[PDB]
């Protein structure tokens, strides 16, 4: 028997043309290979609306959403996948990352813990918000690294752990190691960039983001993160240009905002600081075109 309603906690997009298609899962996967995340997410939403028992659909949706700068929706989707397959280690890794971003410390540590101990190769094994949980995660990961040295994902996972406690120096070293081992992994470069940025190294962060974008040119979270690093260095032309790219790509260019509404408000702050009150007035309407044109990304 089919089940249609283990999905009522997810705010599905209303007018989803993928609901009319024959194989939206296949199409979502194709859109991912194209790096069209907003579009990928809509196709996976269709699958989760029709077949909410398909774990792979929730996993793909979750992964796509966090890449499209929507951690809250990522966590909702991923929790479904986690219920339908508690050994899907990609779901646990992703939950750790999105919870770290959301500053859910207990959930992040629990996700790193499940990530490790769900793998048969490792199952034998003052941070104020969750002190002994953090120490146990550190210990597990270090024990794992002595059984499997030079593992990129253990080093990445230590990176996430150390981001949680603001030990950006140790996080950077570990993620640096992980990208040396896997230099075509866009997420790893992004993770290293965010770590450097959060540790007051934006110039180095931007080098990592460029590598991430050269790998995955539709990686909207990297685009956002570049806006952030540029803004942190007061380079507002560069910030503005990347932020406009991010907004456009996040919504899927030609196509329920919220994630978008704070990016627009952030963009307003940039336009204000650069002394452009005409441009500021335009942000209220939340149309990309004026800014795409003003900032050299499109036409005229």
């Amino acid at each position: 028997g089919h089940m249609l309603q283990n999905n009522t906690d997810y705010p599905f997009e209303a007018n989803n043309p993928y609901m009319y298609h024959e194989n939206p899962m296949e199409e979502g996967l194709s859109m991912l290979k194209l790096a069209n995340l907003a579009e990928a997410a809509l196709a996976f939403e269709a699958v989760c609306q029709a077949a909410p028992e398909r774990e792979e659909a929730w996993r793909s949706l979750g992964l796509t959403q966090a890449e499209n700068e929507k951690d809250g929706l990522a966590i909702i989707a991923l929790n479904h996948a986690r219920m339908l397959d508690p050994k899907d280690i990609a779901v646990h890794a992703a939950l750790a990352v999105s919870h770290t971003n959301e500053h859910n410390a207990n959930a992040a540590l629990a996700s790193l813990r499940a990530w490790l101990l769900s793998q048969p190769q490792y199952e034998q094994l003052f941070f104020f918000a969750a002190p002994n949980e953090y120490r146990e995660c550190r210990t597990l990961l270090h024990a794992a690294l002595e059984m499997n040295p030079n593992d990129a994902q253990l080093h990445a996972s230590l990176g996430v752990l150390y981001n949680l406690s603001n030990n950006y120096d140790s996080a950077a070293a570990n993620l640096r190691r992980a990208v040396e081992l896997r230099p075509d992994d866009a997420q790893l470069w992004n993770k290293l960039g965010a770590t450097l940025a959060n540790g007051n190294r934006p110039q180095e962060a931007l080098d990592a983001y460029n590598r991430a974008l050269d790998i995955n040119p539709g990686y909207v979270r990297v685009m956002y993160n570049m806006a952030v690093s540029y803004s942190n260095m007061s380079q507002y032309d560069l910030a503005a240009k990347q932020l406009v790219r991010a907004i456009y790509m996040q919504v899927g260019g030609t196509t329920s905002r919220e994630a978008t509404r704070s990016m627009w408000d952030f963009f307003r702050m940039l336009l204000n600081v650069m002394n452009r009150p005409d441009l500021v007035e335009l942000t209220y309407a939340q149309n990309v075109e004026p800014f795409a044109k003003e900032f050299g990304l499109q036409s005229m």
């Binding site: 700068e69 951690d71 990352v97 770290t100 971003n101 996430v160 981001n163 992004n190 993770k191 960039g193 965010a194 770590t195 940025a197 959060n198 007051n200 934006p202 962060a205 979270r221 956002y224 993160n225 952030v228 690093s229 803004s231 942190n232 952030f266």
Partner: peptide, 6 residues
């Protein structure tokens, strides 16, 4: 400064 995301 503003926060970056993993």
């Amino acid at each position: 400064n503003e926060l970056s995301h993993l």
